Design a protein around this ligand. Structure first.
Ligand SMILES: OC[C@H]1O[C@@H](O)[C@H](O)[C@@H](O)[C@@H]1O
Ligand SMILES: OC[C@H]1O[C@@H](O)[C@H](O)[C@@H](O)[C@@H]1O
Ligand SMILES: [Ca+2]
Ligand SMILES: [Ca+2]
Lengths: 761, 767
């Protein structure tokens, strides 16, 4: 049908259309309408755009630390740059264009613009441009650009490679060397810190015959074509931009030249990309019946998750994906807790490879732990190629003094480690993949249990272990003790480790133990900690205290009342002396995050009482927060409140609602964790899907705004399809080697055999 | 035999004189030139001064928390206010007066002014005024004020009780009620928080036969005497100001009036004060030969220490004494570590009472530990009447933002508890007072050991205990782990508790264990801690790390270069994001403080390497710091370096060298810990005096600036006097005379069984 928001609509449920150009909203648009394929992201700019419009092509595995502090992915030369003059006048976007639309077609990752603007000579010029990053040939991004005049006119088209690109924390590439090949130009350059080679090759094909002249200068190269446009006769340019680095392959320039030489036409490459995207959507599409706005917003988020996910090499999903350099193209706990579940239940080999990325980087976690005085694996807060910590000590500034502030994201926020062990165990429960636990997952869980045993303190007069001096998911409170989320998660790891010691076969167990030198003394300490570690529990009013002493901080309800205490609008809110430090205002889900990860650990009334206590004290100043409260709301029958938090979460980028800057650091770009959680809110939230042992739970609720929804979930290799209407719930076991399962729908057991099982409200 | 600084001089080494009036120096001058007697402090203002000149009389045991945050002593109505007009023109000090001096006579606590100023009618008026707080009648402060003109003239003298007095954190008295008595006026008021009664009584005698009209307003009472002054004929006014509270007596108004009734003349009261002061100087005086500036600065310091010390009731010595309300008139670790030693060696009953004050307040320490989730005794950082914590959570503000900052003086600076255990053990070593350990000290040491055991964490993969998230004596670095000073002091306390459990007789030991419920399981934890607690040790270069990760912070030498980073000059330098937080610059001695308390803990080379490493990293922003470096330096025969820090320390108040405002909070007033430390630097630092049961040790060093020094000590009831010069040392025993006295002078034993021993002394500058 209709209207999403600003001036955005959908016509099909698969497309987002913006029909007014406004330069204020251009750029937010560069993120939202971007294209990509897990190897690169190419911002949704128009072919004339460069550094002033924040154009960028961000490429995986090109980390560089040129400014001496921020290691982030490189932005590379732009081989799609294309500039039009019409009788001398440059074509420049105006808000008064006779006609403007930009469209992102989510069914195939094709982004485009159609614009008509009358020029000073009277000619009305129409440009249609479309671009996509090939999911078939992941090193290539392709464009078709067509210009048409309604009136005979001369014009000039320049096209080439722009070296002078936007980069947030210093230019990452130096030493640019021009070269030519039969279909265009190329540039090879080297990164600043590691001196890796990056090559961009441009191919260019123009359908009109015209004298053409090349140019090469220190800021780019290219060629110019004078055109005689005839009334109503369009001229089409097709370009490919191909990128390889020495981290992808041995002699990248050679390789980029071969990929260029064998590239097929724009249309042939477009059809092959469409076939790959049909296959992606067959895994991940979730349908929503009779709410096309919600339907398209969900597809927008899943689309953004997919294009942020590297599948060509063992690499992290960035917390802003490849939409820009913010958050360093690197993995945070968002990767396992927010992004992995869609993959776990829809295409588990992708989840396995996420976890294998954490295995591959376990040495970085071992070195981090040792550097900080611990043992085991303390995973990096911000993980890039090797697993060494990329998060600086001074992430932010105190904007009131101009001084760096020391936030302990990188060394007190320890929950990253047991979050990884949790994800290992979840992946094992859902898939039944024993071999993963034998070869990789058991070693991971035990090194994480060893780390937690080395961080913990024992308090002999209280007879208990405690986790002191931490930062929990609510990052604004640092230096807290016995954060409830972290304590519980630590106990779930130790419990998983204890289970493996009792359950693995003796040969696998001996091998893992000898590999990581695990002693009987440590195993005894883990079992002592399982029996005596303090875990925050519900008080006489049902409330789980967020960390020790949180109840004595100042109650401010609702939490945004604290924003009245700001002196400058862009002050960091948290430690050491931000406005929230001695208040109960929290950045995001912390106790409520516990219930998302462990939905049946506490009973529905305890979860409700904690929801009703913490929601009004949460700022939701991380994109991670609204979806956690949506998922918990859906399952204590606060469905309409869940729906509202669903909308907050699915619309964060589309309708632009979160802070670009905080404490002097750029925080903006696409919110990849929120993209992942879109799927979770429907399937784990409204659907109530969770897996305990052999036990599959479903509890499907239905927002009043929808007439139904449907999703697939793969549990123990069985592909199930769950369809929810007003009246009923249908579960179909699709699949060749089909086995019996056993459900729990709204708390009743009902052994599934073979395609029947309809039940009601 | 004259210049100290500014326009400050001494004539005899017993007096300090300032011969220029500077209105900007009033806060400093009124502290330095004050009078007092341990019961009150009366700032050294002149008789016409009030709120604008920071006049104050600060009275012990009148704590009030009117503003809801700072509990501080009350400033009370001023019964010495005296204003002169000459032919209708008010007498106002001019910075260009014909003649001016103020004098503090340290021999007897008398502070005075003589001033001559020419008035508009041409008369030159001379005022001579002196005041003292009686050490004989501790509730009385007296004044004699004399005016004379070289020209016949009308004058008016208005004298009375000013109620409108300066108070730092809000007015503390309300309900002021005027009354009269045969020799003047009085006022009775009540404190805001606790509704305690305070009465001030004024007595007033004028030796001119002129008549008087009285006035009573809401801001004060008094009377005006219109005079006809005769050229060359002085007029004298004598007053007493008497103060009682209902924390001192049941009926303070009656007692103040009974005191008034039995007052003698100004001159008789002054003579009785003189006698008390002769007795005090006979215990505490330390003389220095041929350096009259160091001699007077030493007596000025000792004097301030004496008048800050309450001897009339069980009360703390305040960290700014009674010089003003700053630091809450309350005890800090300063009291045991800085002020106690002169008393310990010179008049040990006073040290015993300092420790009994800490025993009396053990319940406030136990409530503080419980409130913070610990057990045993976590003493208050700032202790007043009860021992409950007086230090606010929000001591300072971030002056860049105006917001409060949370510093953890009151809940992470845990060394206060083992500092008190240390002072209990030191007191016992010096005095052999077993009875104190039976009745009081073993209970204190065990509750402090129980607290430390409750604070520590055990690291099972490291196999050891550690003390995490503390703040050491260097207050600027908070949230540090294994501060060396703290970890060693904790192990000394557990060692002392362990020694008592293994040594005390079964009767005394059962009574204490039963009183505090000390369990065998607790004892086994202390003994496990003794065997397995991490204690920072010297590294391959001999240096003990101040806390974990200190060596990774930024080196700035000289440390003062760090103040170039300041954005406002009065910012707090420390936590959470002050300019020193991520640097090696330290507020005050911290590793070096450990060697002050434990001079043989490590060999001389190790102490020297740490001194050389840390002294250039020290800002000495705190007045506690230079004396610690002087003592450590003197103990390792770095005599001239010890003398450089001695000179810095003794002049801190006299030359106004330290900051008065920080982080938006007033921290000025007289620096009582530094005043107490003056005596230790000479006697324990240069003298090397220490006393361990029967053995008395001296290791007398002599700075090149002095030709000798002498001091007294009272060891197991024998009064010893020691005279050190470059070429010899004499020791006399001047008492009732029990022969058993054993002395070690450097390595050599003497039995002091005659009345005088004389030994030659060699130079002990280290080569
Ligand atoms: O998305 C990366 C990070 O963004 C932050 O603002 C959130 O507080 C973190 O929980 C999250 O991991
Ligand atoms: O004198 C009272 C307090 O003053 C502070 O400035 C010092 O850093 C403390 O060590 C001292 O205890
Ligand atoms: Ca072809
Ligand atoms: Ca409710």
């Amino acid at each position: 049908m209709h209207e999403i928001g600003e001036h955005l609509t959908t016509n099909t449920g698969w497309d987002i259309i913006k029909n007014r150009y406004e330069a204020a909203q251009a750029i937010t648009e560069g993120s939202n309408f971007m294209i990509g394929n897990g190897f690169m992201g190419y911002r949704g700019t128009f072919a004339e755009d460069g550094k002033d419009a924040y154009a960028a092509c961000i490429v995986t595995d090109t980390w560089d630390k040129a400014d001496g502090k921020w290691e982030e992915l490189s932005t590379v030369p732009n081989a799609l740059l294309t500039l039009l003059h019409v009788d001398g006048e440059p074509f420049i976007m105006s808000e008064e264009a006779a006609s403007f639309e930009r469209t992102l077609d989510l069914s195939q990752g094709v982004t485009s613009r159609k614009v008509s603007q009358r020029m000073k000579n009277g000619a009305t010029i129409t440009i249609h441009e479309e671009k996509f990053a090939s999911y078939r040939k992941k090193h290539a991004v392709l464009m078709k650009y067509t210009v048409e005049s309604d009136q005979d006119t001369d014009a000039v088209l320049d096209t080439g490679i722009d070296y002078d690109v936007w980069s947030i924390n210093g230019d990452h590439l130096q030493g640019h060397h021009y070269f030519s090949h039969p279909t265009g130009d190329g540039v090879t350059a080297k990164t600043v810190s590691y001196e890796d080679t990056v090559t961009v090759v441009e191919t260019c094909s123009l359908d009109a015959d015209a004298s053409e002249e090349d140019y090469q200068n220190p800021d780019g190269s290219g060629r110019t074509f004078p055109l005689s446009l005839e009334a109503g006769k369009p001229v089409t340019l097709e370009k490919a931009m191909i990128i390889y680095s020495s981290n992808d392959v041995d002699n990248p320039q050679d390789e980029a030249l071969l990929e260029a030489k064998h590239m097929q036409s724009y249309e042939e490459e477009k059809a092959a990309n469409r076939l790959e995207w049909d296959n992606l959507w067959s895994h991940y599409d979730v349908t929503i019946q009779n709410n096309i706005i919600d339907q398209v917003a969900l597809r927008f988020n899943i689309y953004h998750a997919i294009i942020a996910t590297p599948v060509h090499k063992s690499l992290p999903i960035g917390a802003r994906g490849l939409s820009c350099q913010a958050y360093q193209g690197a993995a945070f706990w968002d990767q396992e807790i927010y992004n992995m579940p869609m993959y776990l239940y829809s295409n588990p080999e992708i989840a396995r490879n996420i976890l294998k990325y954490r295995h591959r980087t376990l040495d970085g976690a071992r070195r981090k732990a040792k550097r900080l005085g611990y043992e085991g694996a303390y995973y990096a807060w911000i993980s890039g190629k090797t697993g060494d910590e990329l998060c600086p000590d001074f992430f932010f500034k105190d904007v009131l003094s101009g001084r760096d502030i020391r936030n302990h994201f990188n060394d007190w926020q320890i929950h990253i480690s047991p979050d990884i062990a949790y994800a290992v165990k979840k992946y094992h429960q859902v898939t039944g993949d024993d071999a993963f636990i034998r070869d990789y997952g058991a070693e991971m869980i035990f090194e994480i249990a060893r780390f937690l045993a080395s961080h913990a303190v024992y308090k002999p007069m209280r007879g208990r272990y405690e986790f002191m001096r931490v930062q929990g998911p609510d990052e604004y409170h640092e230096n807290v003790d016995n954060n409830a989320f972290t304590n519980h998660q630590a106990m779930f790891t130790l419990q998983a480790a204890d289970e493996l010691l009792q359950t693995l076969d003796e040969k696998t167990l001996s091998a893992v133990k000898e590999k990581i030198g695990l002693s009987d003394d440590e195993i005894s300490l883990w079992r002592d900690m399982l029996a005596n570690t303090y875990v925050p529990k519900p008080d006489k009013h049902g409330i789980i205290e967020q960390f020790d002493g949180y109840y004595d901080l100042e109650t401010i309800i609702p939490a945004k009342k604290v924003t009245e205490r700001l002196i400058k609008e862009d002050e960091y809110y948290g430690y050491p002396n931000g406005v929230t430090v001695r208040t109960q205002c929290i950045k995001q889900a912390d106790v409520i995050q516990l219930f998302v990860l462990h939905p049946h650990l506490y009973d529905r009334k305890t979860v409700e009482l904690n929801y009703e206590f913490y929601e009004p004290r949460t700022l939701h100043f991380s994109s991670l927060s609204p979806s956690s409260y949506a998922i918990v709301a859906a399952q204590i029958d606060k469905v309409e409140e869940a729906y509202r938090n669903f909308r907050k979460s699915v619309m964060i980028d589309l309708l632009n609602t979160n802070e670009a800057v905080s404490g002097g650091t750029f925080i903006g770009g696409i919110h990849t964790a929120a993209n992942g959680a879109s799927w979770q809110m429907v399937v784990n939230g409204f659907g109530g899907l969770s897996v305990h042992g052999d036990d599959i739970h479903l509890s499907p609720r239905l927002p009043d705004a929808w007439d139904g929804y449907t999703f697939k979930a793969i549990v123990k290799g069985q592909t199930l399809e769950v369809d929810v209407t007003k009246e009923q719930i249908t579960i179909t076991n699709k699949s060749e080697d089909r086995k019996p399962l056993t459900l729990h729908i709204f708390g009743e057991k009902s052994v599934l055999d073979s395609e029947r099982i309809t039940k009601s409200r």
